[PDB]
């Protein structure tokens, strides 16, 4: 398992070498997408029987 360790170290090295964004910005992004596509959400706002295929 010398090979297993050698394969392992390069994996994290690649994993650690990525640009990481603040959760503050990524938090806004999940908020932004949900509010911008909110009014197209059937399950969130129930739709009248005329536009309800079921």
């Amino acid at each position: 398992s010398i090979a297993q360790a050698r394969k392992l170290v390069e994996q994290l090295k690649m994993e650690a070498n990525i640009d990481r964004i603040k959760v503050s910005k990524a938090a806004a992004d999940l908020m932004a997408y949900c509010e911008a596509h909110a009014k197209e959400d059937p399950l969130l706002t129930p739709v009248p029987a005329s536009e309800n295929p079921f």
Partner: peptide, 22 residues
């Protein structure tokens, strides 16, 4: 490598706290 490997988990864990703005 093992003592090295557990260090690589640290920079990953270290940076993740620093990017935990809120």
């Amino acid at each position: 490598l093992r003592q090295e490997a557990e260090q690589l988990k640290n920079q990953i864990r270290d940076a993740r706290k620093a990017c935990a703005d809120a």
